[PDB]
Amino acid sequence: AYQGFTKLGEREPLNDIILWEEITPTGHSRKEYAPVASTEYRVGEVLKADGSKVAAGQEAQADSVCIVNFYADLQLSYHGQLKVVGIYRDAELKDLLKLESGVDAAAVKSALKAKGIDFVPTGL
Amino acid sequence: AYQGFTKLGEREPLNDIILWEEITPTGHSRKEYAPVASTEYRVGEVLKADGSKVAAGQEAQADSVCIVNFYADLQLSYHGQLKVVGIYRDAELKDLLKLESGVDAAAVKSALKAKGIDFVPTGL
Amino acid sequence: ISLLDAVDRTSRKAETSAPERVRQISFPMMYFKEVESITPDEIQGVRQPGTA
Numbered sequence: 475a476y477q478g479f480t481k482l483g484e485r486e487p488l489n490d491i492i493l494w495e496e497i498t499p500t501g502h503s504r505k506e507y508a509p510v511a512s513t514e515y516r517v518g519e520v521l522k523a524d525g526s527k528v529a530a531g532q533e534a535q536a537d538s539v540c541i542v543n544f545y546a547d548l549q550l551s552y553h554g555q556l557k558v559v560g561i562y563r564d565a566e567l568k569d570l571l572k573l574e575s576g577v578d579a580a581a582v583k584s585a586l587k588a589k590g591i592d593f594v595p596t597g598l
Numbered sequence: 599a600y601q602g603f604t605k606l607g608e609r610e611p612l613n614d615i616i617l618w619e620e621i622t623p624t625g626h627s628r629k630e631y632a633p634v635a636s637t638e639y640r641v642g643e644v645l646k647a648d649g650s651k652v653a654a655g656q657e658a659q660a661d662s663v664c665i666v667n668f669y670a671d672l673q674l675s676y677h678g679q680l681k682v683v684g685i686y687r688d689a690e691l692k693d694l695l696k697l698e699s700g701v702d703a704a705a706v707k708s709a710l711k712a713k714g715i716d717f718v719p720t721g722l
Numbered sequence: 723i724s725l726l727d728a729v730d731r732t733s734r735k736a737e738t739s740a741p742e743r744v745r746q747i748s749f750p751m752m753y754f755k756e757v758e759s760i761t762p763d764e765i766q767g768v769r770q771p772g773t774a
Contacts, residue, residue, distance in 0.1 A: 488763065488764040488768065489761065489763035489764060490759075490760075490761065490763070490764045492759065492761060492763075493622075493623055493624075493757060493758075493759050494622040494623050494624075494626075494759075541763075552767075553766070553767070564626075566622055566623060566624060566626065592622075592624065592626060594623075594624060594757065623757040623759075624757065674750060678750045678751065679750075679753075680750070
């Protein structure tokens with residue numbers, strides 16, 4: 475283009491982080507979340523109890539791991555769902571986390587470890 | 599002096615106390631430990647977080663039940679493995695346990711019960 | 723093996739050789755494990771790259 479290039483972006487994360495979860499007729503490791511206004515959700519980000527993300531100093535309040543892509547513009551998920559679903563009970567997930575600036579990964583994992591969540595070393 | 603007899607030894611316990619456990623792609627119910635120097639592990643011995651055995655007064659610090667036989671001088675398990683492992687999460691084990699001197703069996707059982715381990719009564 | 727020294731003949735002197743030596747060693751092995759899973763969530767409504 476005008477400066478030679480035109481990047482158009484890349485694909486959002488797919489929900490392949492789940493390796494093992496407690497299968498149950500009504501769902502066991504999944505809980506619904508009311509999306510916070512003007513908030514964007516992607517697969518991997520850690521959520522607090524109210525539904526917001528985890529900032530610096532709030533690692534011990536890690537509640538769940540998002541497994542949906544939510545858009546604040548449409549107020550809908552990428553699968554046409556009204557609510558955000560995260561993994562909070564016992565499960566095993568790939569180590570493809572998504573944390574904001576200043577968040578301690580080890581502290582966040584420790585909070586989820588005590589809640590039954592296990593992480594597998596992924597690598598590249 | 600050959601005092602009459604020669605006892606070559608007694609067979610170390612086999613890994614058969616596991617009756618049921620939450621088995622996943624990875625070790626959901628089993629965790630790894632770094633062996634402590636000059637420490638011998640057998641199957642059915644309770645370990646603390648650091649990897650040492652539970653002594654008198656430390657019954658509430660019980661972490662896991664060892665399920666492999668480790669040789670201190672050889673520094674290898676009886677399966678040719680480098681690290682000792684034990685069951686710490688939810689599982690059902692046989693009542694046969696090897697505790698140290700002056701260790702309250704009931705206190706150890708209650709500590710492991712809270713983590714998720716239950717002990718089926720075994721009889722003979 | 724070693725060299726041999728000459729001795730006198732009238733005196734019936736001689737010499738001998740040392741025995742052999744044996745040992746034993748052991749080897750452990752390395753264990754590798756890899757796990758993967760596939761779910762409908764990564765297939766539903768996903769465009770194949772390179773296609774419209």
